[PDB]
Design a protein around this nucleic acid. Structure first.
Ligand SMILES: [Zn+2]
Lengths: 290, 464, 259, 215, 221, 289, 239
RNA sequence: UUUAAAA
RNA sequence: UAUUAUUUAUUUUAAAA
């Protein structure tokens, strides 16, 4: 019930790496071309980078805040993997290493690192708050699971819109989405994950390994940056021991990637906003005088 | 009473104390490290430069206290000054005077008590230390961390008794530590009980004088003697009590309109009188916001006041208060509140006054304002309680908890009040939205429309 | 380790004899050497560690919570966690249900000694962590919760009804009579006290007896020690075992309350 | 759906709004899924008890090489008077220590026997405020009935009785004790507990054979 | 009009994507593959049906959605020519296209059409063809409508899911695979929509046959 | 009575090399256990003393399980009956394997066809049975291969089992010895000891097939004084192990006679009496001879 | 406690230490001889950890047997009383434990020579009795010392240290209060080398500030290796 | 609780 | 009967002639 790699295939891919050759034709520091597609409802995002395809789905509901932080909203994320992305995955295996690590990294990047404005999700302190949920669906597994999932969640949160709320003394009314247009969430910074795969025949490091390269891997490193030159999160455990010089090279190379991907999400959101707001030029209330 | 030796001169003990909060107990244990490399920071000292250690930026500590202090009359002569919590909170303005204090020692236990009771005062005290130069010199001696000055707690000893004793042990050590250089240590405390306990400690005699006694001994006493400085809301009535009170002509219903230039004077228009009924004071307003429908109860003619003739807003009132205050006086407010008391005594316009006893409808909404820089820790990424100065001057300060106080600084934000119980001095709100930077044309206009419930959102798509 | 059927019949015939030939050869009333540590968890109101002779180890922690007894039923909760076993295991839920009966507020433990105001009282959280176990550890845990409750310090109360306040430094000592649990193994017609690992494997049945206030108290059980040789016992053996603990329990309390 | 809204609270009934003989009924053989069935009901004073016991066995365990059989007893809540799951499993381990001394285990090598007791209704009609002790004797009689109906060999019948929280299970017409359970109660009392339970044991020992010999 | 694609996923034997109104369902099929010990059938093929919601985790709602989707695909597959083998059919609901808390017929209908197309792309032996449509009747004017919108469901008296089996060029209705009805209706309304549905499914397979032929024909020679 | 040692306050009461450090830079060496080769230099993988024998460079760690070697009279317990072999618990890193063609079968060979090989083995050698055998050879991973191809090795009975650390077994010519009181000790070099009543074979063979040895039937009549003698032997053997004293034949009978002072063996479990008997042997024998 | 000074201008922290001073480090070996093959009672500051290594032994079931190396299983048990407030078990709190356990397995499976022990398993049972910041680093130190006690062959030491960055000042061995007020980096340094086997950054840190934090992190971790190494010297010479 | 007009 | 065996294989000595 697992993937079988022949000895010749393992030797060919590794020797190709020793000759600066990747089967797909990318460089060692080249990220796969990401493609963001937005659905009908808000918070519906499908990410395609190479043969890897992931689909995200944002939702929210009124919930009880944590008693330790009565002024913050909750953030939930589930990254279960179905046999759809490959028969090597068992359906119902929620506690798998890939599922746990993917959830924890996006959770640290979004919730813990302040990417999502949880204080803006506060309705009534200590009682009512927004619980923004992010569902991730692994459609086709060709490596880069957490890299694609982090782009899907961050694109979904910036594309998602929550119902409106009016403060009337001690009363609070939630407008239906059919009456008033929903309000977008608060997104401070945009964290993007970049995973590095290491090999040894003098070590070789490739960015965003495919499924075949991921299986012949000797060590994995995940970094998360934003356009503000901040290191949102780093996860490296085991594998080939590395030093501070190799990491900083990974972070500087990843910053060149996350900066371009950030500008793409901002541009692709702007294009999607205009597509669904054709007659928005007539409905403007706040207008300039003369 | 445990203690363990570690590296060179380093030892550690176990600090245990019980914390009572919301009727619940929590035993708290903390590591307390005692060290012997803390300098006296006196330029005259020739025993501490040999034990100092550079900081994280590899920089040796500069010795601040002058080698030729102010020489007073015998037997004081050359002396350093050590303060307690009371003097720092009371005469903080006198400390900033350039013709008063010159070489002052602020111990750690005093600095911690000031920060716990007034953060803006603690900040101005650290500023005296940081800005020490030729005419002003302030230091902080970490007496609680020094192996020589740290004092264990005695059985059944008051919490204030130990901290008062820690101040004495600090002066006793400084007195002995500076004997070679012929410099005395003058302890300035207003606690008469603390000074008497210092006279009983014959093992190390120190000089203790009050604030008025120390000022009179200065050479320029005739010039600085004129600058010396000298709660719970009543619960709301029951719903049954306000029913019979309105029925039997005891209570009255109306809407509070806080005065234009004074956030502590409100008037309620009643059909019985031609002049609106004044409500003066915090206790009489009883946690009411401008625009609420309240229930008032008339006060006797012994308490009737005149319309106030002073200007007050939340920003210029109780500026030295912490937001989390629950169940420190400025000299400027003393000279201001007592000044208005003379007007309400000699005035003829004394009209009936009442007090709020019940809130019927809260006029709360989304208010716009900015954070008070006096209560923000610019380098802290932890949850901290900060003040919010609302745009509407008729409203008080709002306390909110936020972990982005540094980021939200110099921003124009939106909040909404959650509650205001009898025990809290200030209302509790929460952050909802950030509009932009202060004095930004895009943010100030949007903050203006929100402050007047102006619908600036685009028209509905059903309008098409 | 396990035991072969050859040596199983060797111990049965030697233990059931009128001169009880114990494996280590002790008397049917002698216990094994025990090491007990106390007061090592600063974050807890009370703590204790006990190490049995066969390497068995148990750690107990005691936390406190201010609760309104008019709405909180049980003021003493026991939470057991055996290493290498799930939290919903049968061997864990049985001891958890049994230890909450020996330490039930108002029964084995009087709720008056941990009360505060007329409205409020203290709730004791007894958390058990069994690191190693070779036999039924309900008797070894009872010794650990004994030494921990007799070294527990709770915050002193400072005293119209309002929420209670406590002093900053001074704390009171928890004076509660902590019940004790003993395990008895019957091998034929002989009653054994504190059975070892191999001894409890050939026993015909077992007895659990509580002990509080210098007398036998509820609850008492007769759970089996091994599903192989489960034999019914004569009621005179139940009386002999119930009377044997009365003869040697004060020797335990005296050797256990010294701390 | 299931569970329902989390914001809902269960109904609360206030006590201040408006204000010898132990009956027994036995049946057996009525569940087609299992081998042996049983249904015992008892209503004395203001406490009515009705529980159902099913026996699924003997089941041949694949790959097992045990010499004797293994008994698995599991108590399960029903619809009224729900007990905590920890105390239910405590009575299960106490019951397994009883039937392992009664059921002929050597007659079932490489196999196991699974017992299922359903406390479907435990009514209590006290006027104004362990309660599980009043059901242990009724559960022991129910399992012995279903074990006998399932063709499983049982060395003598097994019954028990309650005496103020004291539950004692006898065998061989009370000659030897097979189980002892006592919660709450008083001190010194023991001779009267073993006597009141023994006469209650003989009352159940012959009444079980009554319905087992008829039908 | 409905949209559908084939062979979209790489690491599975057969995939598809079915779209109707706003309901989008991506389905994948992998088989025959090695079954688990608790799955193998001695004589025929075993099926593993999995449907996952667009939001939240898989609840009991999708469990009855699996059981209905299983009852449709099981007679539609020649299970006996794959003894001791496994087929994994996984449906992923991208957008529900309806109120999930109230209705689930628009998702069941799309999962049937997505699973059938994915089974065609995978190469599993199918006994025939299949089509599924949702049917509803409006409260005020008791009118039968085929493929109702999300707003029409909230104003309907009863909802229906009709799944038919087509043989011989998509003209002969061999059997009625699934007819799931909930709401208020009598015997006259049943055969009125059943007759109406038989001709709307008849033009669906005619359009489905065109969809799959436009994709499989360029693959073959 | 109970002896409860109480403590309050805290939680509890040649060249040495550590894993990672350099032991030598001489390439002319043969690396042994606790030692790994790297970059023409030699490093340590455990924490212990450096050993040098001819050219074999190794590190002997402090704590370590029993390392089986060829020709060891061990005592092991059967874990499972596997395919054409047994898994016997010797006490090492892995279970030792006992092949079918390495024991004295009851009827000489298998009686087939009827049952499989595995099921027929459980009739006389089931799981949990205790026996003794000799390590015939070793596998590449270090696993031991046992054999019972002599009347000396068989299935143990008529006694009690005890366990001591493997390092505390002094090497000698004889593995099992006869003891006063009609008792025979089986000092397994792996740390497993079997104290039993002296049988007809070990008494008549050390002084100057059939399935009768695979019988689980114990001896019918054992003297009540002989069984109580085994307890004292077990208590003094575990006492010498508590005092980290090597176990030999003379030190067993020396502690057996020195334990007469304590009458019944009930007080032989305390640590004060254990350290006394251990110190009485280490001083009155090593300093007197 | 209350509002405190994190790093005073006098270079003193809230607990009295300085920027490069570690908490008290009291380690112990062979604390559970009759319950495991390797034992280590780690007491780093107020952190109290019990690490038990059981192996190499035969797997209980052949479903977890590797014919070329040993299997490494790390079980981290965080007691309900590890903090002040007795924490109740949360469904979300179980995910953070699995991430730590996996990070520990992947860390030590590369440093422990599993090839020398084939067809075996090595169970690592951990019990956290009290935590006060830097718990991830202290878990590493307990595993390293417990594996050495069990005689398991390793390539070198693995030292765990936690570094915090406050404004522009890095701080070594962060406690619970300091972690609540700054960003924290945990490191897994291999022996005296500058090689990392673990690097967890769970809070925002500027990129230009990360280079220096790692240097001071690997440096302070060498000091942790010395404290662990010396404890093994004293325990070997006295026995 | 700022009159009126155009914005 | 380890030059023996395990079949969707728990074998962990298949080497020499
Ligand atoms: Zn000095």
């Amino acid at each position: 019930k697992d993937i079988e790699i022949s000895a010749s295939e393992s030797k060919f891919i590794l020797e190709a790496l020793r000759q600066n050759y990747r089967l797909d034709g990318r460089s060692f520091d080249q990220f796969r071309d990401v493609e963001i597609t937005f659905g009908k409802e808000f918070g519906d995002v499908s990410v395609k980078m190479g043969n890897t395809k992931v689909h995200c789905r944002i939702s929210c509901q009124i919930a009880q805040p944590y008693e330790d932080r009565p002024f913050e909203g909750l953030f939930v994320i589930s990254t279960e993997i179905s046999p759809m992305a490959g028969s090597q995955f068992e359906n119902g295996n929620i506690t798998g290493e890939d599922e746990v690590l993917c959830s924890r990294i996006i959770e640290k990047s979004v919730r813990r690192s302040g990417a999502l404005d949880v204080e803006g999700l506060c309705i009534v302190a200590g009682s009512k708050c927004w619980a923004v949920r992010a569902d991730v669906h692994f459609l086709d597994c060709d490596g880069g699971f957490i890299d694609a999932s982090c782009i899907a969640v961050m694109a979904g949160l910036m594309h998602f819109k929550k119902p409106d709320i009016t403060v009337h003394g001690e009363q609070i009314i939630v407008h239906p989405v059919n009456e008033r247009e929903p309000v977008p969430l608060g997104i401070l910074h945009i964290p993007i994950c970049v995973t590095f795969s290491f090999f040894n025949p003098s070590e070789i490091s490739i960015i965003d390994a495919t499924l075949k390269e991921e299986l012949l891997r000797d060590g994995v490193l995940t970094v998360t940056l934003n356009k503000n030159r901040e290191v949102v999160q780093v996860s490296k455990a085991g594998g080939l021991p590395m030093d501070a010089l190799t990491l900083m090279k990974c972070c500087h190379e990843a910053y060149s990637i996350i900066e371009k991907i950030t500008d793409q999400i901002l541009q692709l959101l702007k294009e999607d906003s205009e597509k669904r707001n054709k007659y928005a030029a007539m409905l403007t209330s706040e207008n300039a005088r003369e | 009473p445990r203690r363990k030796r570690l590296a060179d001169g380093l030892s550690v003990t176990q600090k245990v104390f019980v914390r009572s909060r919301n009727g619940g107990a929590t035993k708290i244990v903390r590591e307390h490290y005692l060290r012997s490399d803390i300098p006296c920071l006196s330029r005259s000292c020739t025993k501490c430069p040999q034990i100092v250690v550079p900081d994280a930026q590899n920089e040796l500590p500069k010795f601040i206290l002058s080698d030729s202090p102010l020489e007073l009359s015998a037997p004081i002569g050359k002396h350093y000054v050590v303060l307690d919590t009371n003097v720092v909170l009371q005469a903080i303005d006198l400390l900033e005077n350039p013709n008063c204090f010159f070489d002052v020692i602020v111990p750690q236990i005093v600095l911690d008590e000031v920060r716990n009771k007034s953060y803006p005062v603690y900040t101005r005290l650290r500023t005296l230390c940081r800005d020490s130069d030729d005419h002003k010199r302030f230091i902080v001696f970490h007496n609680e961390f020094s192996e020589h000055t740290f004092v264990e707690r005695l059985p059944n000893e008051t919490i204030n008794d130990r901290n008062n004793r820690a101040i004495r042990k600090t002066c006793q050590w400084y007195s002995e530590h500076l004997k070679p250089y012929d410099i005395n240590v003058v302890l300035v405390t207003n606690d008469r009980l603390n000074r008497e306990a210092a006279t009983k400690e014959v093992e190390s005699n120190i000089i203790t004088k009050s604030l008025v006694q120390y000022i009179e001994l200065l050479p320029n006493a005739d010039d600085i003697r004129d600058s010396i400085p000298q709660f719970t809301f009543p619960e709301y009535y029951s719903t049954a009590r306000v029913m019979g009170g309105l029925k039997n002509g005891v209570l009255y219903q109306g809407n509070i309109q806080i005065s234009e230039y004074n956030f502590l004077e409100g008037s309620v228009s009643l059909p019985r009188f031609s002049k609106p009924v004044l409500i003066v004071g915090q206790k009489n307003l009883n946690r009411a916001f401008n625009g609420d429908q309240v229930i008032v109860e008339l006060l006797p003619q012994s308490e009737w006041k005149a319309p106030s003739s002073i200007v007050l807003d939340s920003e210029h009132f109780d500026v030295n208060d912490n937001p989390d205050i629950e169940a420190v006086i400025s000299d400027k407010q003393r000279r201001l509140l007592a000044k208005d008391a003379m007007i309400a005594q000699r005035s003829k316009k004394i009209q009936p006054t009442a007090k709020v006893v019940y809130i019927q409808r809260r006029s709360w909404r989304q208010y716009v304002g900015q954070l008070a820089p006096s209560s923000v820790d610019p380098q802290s990424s932890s949850t901290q309680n900060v003040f919010v100065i609302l745009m509407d001057k008729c409203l008080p300060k709002v306390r909110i908890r936020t972990r982005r106080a540094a980021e939200l600084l110099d921003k124009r934000i939106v909040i909404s009040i959650d509650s205001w119980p009898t025990t809290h001095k200030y209302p509790l709100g929460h952050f909802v939205r950030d509009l932009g930077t202060i004095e930004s044309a895009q943010a100030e206009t949007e903050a203006l429309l929100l402050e007047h419930d102006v619908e600036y959102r685009p028209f509905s798509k059903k309008v098409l | 380790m396990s035991l072969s059927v050859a040596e199983k019949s060797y111990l049965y015939d030697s233990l059931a004899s009128t001169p009880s030939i114990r494996p280590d050869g002790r008397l049917p009333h002698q216990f094994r050497p025990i090491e007990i540590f106390t007061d090592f968890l600063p974050s807890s109101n009370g703590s204790s560690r006990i190490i049995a002779s066969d390497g068995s180890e148990c750690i107990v922690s005691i936390k406190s919570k201010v609760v309104d007894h008019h709405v909180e039923n049980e003021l003493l909760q026991v939470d057991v966690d055996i290493a290498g076993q799930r939290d919903d295991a049968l061997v864990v839920e049985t001891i958890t249900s049994l230890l909450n009966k020996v330490l039930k507020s108002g029964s084995g433990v009087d709720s008056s000694k941990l009360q505060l105001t007329k409205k409020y009282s203290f709730k004791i959280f007894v958390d058990v962590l069994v690191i190693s176990s070779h036999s039924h550890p309900v008797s070894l845990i009872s010794f650990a919760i004994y030494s921990a409750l007799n070294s527990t310090y709770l915050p002193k109360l400072i005293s119209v009804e309002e929420l209670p306040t406590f002093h900053d430094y001074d704390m009171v000592k928890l004076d509660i009579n902590p019940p004790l649990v003993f395990i008895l193994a019957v091998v034929g017609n002989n009653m054994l006290l504190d059975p070892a690992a191999n001894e409890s494997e050939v026993a015909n049945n077992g007895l659990i007896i509580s002990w509080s206030n210098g007398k036998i108290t509820s609850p008492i059980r007769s759970v089996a020690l091994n599903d192989s040789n489960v034999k019914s016992f004569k009621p005179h053996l139940l009386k002999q075992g119930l009377a044997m603990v009365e003869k040697y329990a004060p020797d335990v309390v005296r050797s256990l309350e010294n701390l | 759906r299931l569970l329902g809204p989390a914001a809902a609270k269960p109904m609360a009934f206030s006590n201040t709004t408006t204000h010898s003989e132990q009956e027994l009924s036995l049946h057996t053989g009525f569940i087609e899924n299992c081998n042996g069935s049983a249904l015992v009901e008892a209503r004395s004073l203001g406490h009515q008890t009705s529980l159902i016991t099913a026996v699924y066995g003997p089941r041949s365990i694949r790959g097992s090489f045990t010499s004797q059989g293994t008994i698995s007893i599991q108590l399960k809540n029903g619809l009224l008077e729900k007990y905590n799951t920890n105390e239910l499993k405590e009575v299960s381990s106490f019951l397994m220590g009883i039937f392992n001394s009664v059921v002929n285990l050597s007659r079932y090598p490489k196999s196991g026997i699974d017992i299922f007791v359903y406390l479907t209704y435990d009514k209590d009609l006290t006027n104004n405020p362990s309660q599980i002790s009043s059901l242990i004797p009724h559960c022991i009689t129910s399992i012995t009935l279903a074990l006998a109906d399932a063709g499983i060999e049982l060395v003598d019948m097994a019954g028990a009785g309650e005496a103020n929280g004291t539950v004692v299970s006898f065998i061989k017409n009370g000659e030897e004790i097979v189980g002892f359970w006592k919660d709450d109660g008083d001190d010194e009392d023991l001779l009267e507990c073993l006597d009141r339970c023994k006469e209650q044991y003989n009352r159940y020992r012959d009444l079980m054979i009554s319905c087992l010999m008829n039908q | 009009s409905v949209q559908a694609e084939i062979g979209i996923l790489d690491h599975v034997d057969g995939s598809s994507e079915f779209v109707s109104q706003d309901t989008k369902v991506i389905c994948s099929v992998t088989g025959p593959i090695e079954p688990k010990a608790r799955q193998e059938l001695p004589t025929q093929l075993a099926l593993e049906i999995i449907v996952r919601p667009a939001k939240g985790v898989a609840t009991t709602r999708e469990k009855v959605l699996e059981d209905k989707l299983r009852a449709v695909l099981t007679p539609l597959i020649t299970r006996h020519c794959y003894p001791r083998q496994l087929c994994q059919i996984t449906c992923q609901i991208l957008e529900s296209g309806e109120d999930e808390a109230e209705f689930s017929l628009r998702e069941l209908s799309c999962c049937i059409n997505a699973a059938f197309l994915a089974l065609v792309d995978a190469g599993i032996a199918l006994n025939s063809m299949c089509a599924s449509i949702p049917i509803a009747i409006i409260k005020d004017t008791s009118d039968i409508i085929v493929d109702p919108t999300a707003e029409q469901l909230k104003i309907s008296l009863s909802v229906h899911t009709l799944a038919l089996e087509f043989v011989n060029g998509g003209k002969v209705v061999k059997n009625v695979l699934l007819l799931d009805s909930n709401g208020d209706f009598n015997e006259d309304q049943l055969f009125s929509l059943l007759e109406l549905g038989e001709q709307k499914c008849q033009e669906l397979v005619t359009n489905i046959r065109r969809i799959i032929q436009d994709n499989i024909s360029p693959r073959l020679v | 009575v109970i002896t409860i040692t109480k403590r309050n306050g805290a939680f509890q009461n040649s060249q040495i090399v550590t894993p990672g450090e350099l032991v030598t830079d001489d390439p002319i060496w043969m690396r042994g256990h606790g030692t790994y080769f790297l970059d023409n230099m030699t490093y340590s993988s455990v924490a212990g003393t450096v050993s040098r024998v001819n050219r074999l460079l190794s590190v002997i760690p402090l704590k370590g399980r029993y390392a089986p070697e060829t020709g060891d009279h061990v005592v092991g317990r059967i874990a499972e009956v596997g395919n054409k072999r047994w898994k016997v618990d010797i006490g090492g890193k892995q279970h030792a394997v006992l092949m079918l063609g390495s024991v004295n079968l009851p009827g000489g060979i298998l009686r087939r066809k009827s049952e499989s090989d595995e099921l027929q083995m459980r009739s006389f050698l089931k799981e949990g049975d205790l026996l003794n055998a000799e390590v015939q050879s070793l596998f590449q991973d270090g696993s031991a291969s046992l054999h019972t191809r002599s009347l000396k090795y068989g299935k143990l009975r008529n006694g009690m089992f005890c366990q001591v650390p493997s390092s505390l077994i002094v090497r000698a010519k004889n593995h099992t010895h006869n003891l006063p009181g009609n008792i025979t000790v089986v000092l397994g070099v792996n740390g497993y000891i079997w104290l039993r009543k002296t049988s007809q074979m070990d008494l008549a063979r050390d002084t100057p097939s059939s399935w009768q040895i695979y019988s689980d039937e114990n001896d019918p009549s054992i003297s009540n004084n002989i069984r109580q003698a085994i307890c004292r032997y077990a208590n003094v053997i575990k006492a010498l192990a508590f005092c980290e004293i090597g176990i030999t034949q003379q030190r067993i009978v020396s502690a057996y006679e020195a334990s007469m002072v304590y009458s019944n063996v009930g007080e032989l479990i305390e640590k004060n009496v254990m350290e006394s008997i251990g110190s009485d042997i280490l001083t009155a024998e090593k300093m007197r001879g | 406690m209350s509002r405190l000074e994190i790093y005073s201008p006098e270079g003193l922290r809230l607990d009295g230490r300085r920027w490069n001073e570690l908490r008290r480090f009291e380690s112990s070996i062979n604390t559970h001889p009759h319950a495991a093959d390797g034992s280590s009672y780690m007491e780093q500051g107020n952190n109290k950890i019990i690490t038990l290594v059981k192996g190499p032994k035969e797997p209980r079931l052949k479903s977890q047997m590797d014919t070329s190396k040993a299997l490494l299983n790390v079980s981290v048990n965080i007691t309900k009383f590890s903090k002040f407030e007795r924490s109740k078990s949360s469904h979300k709190n179980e995910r953070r434990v699995l991430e730590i356990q996996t990070s520990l397995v992947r860390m030590f499976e590369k440093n422990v020579m599993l090839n020398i022990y084939p067809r075996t398993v090595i169970d690592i049972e951990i019990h956290v009795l009290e935590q006060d910041g830097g718990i991830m680093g202290s878990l590493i130190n307990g595993i390293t010392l417990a594996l050495i006690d069990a005689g398991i062959s390793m390539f070198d030491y693995i030292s765990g240290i936690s570094v915090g960055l406050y404004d522009t000042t890095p701080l070594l061995d962060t406690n619970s209060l300091e972690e609540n007020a700054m960003s924290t980096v945990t490191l897994g340094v291999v022996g005296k080398s500058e090689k990392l086997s673990l690097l967890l950054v769970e809070d925002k840190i500027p990129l230009d500030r990360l280079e220096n934090v790692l240097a001071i992190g690997i440096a302070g971790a060498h000091r942790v290796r010395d404290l662990m190494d010396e404890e093994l010297r004293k325990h070997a010479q006295k026995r």
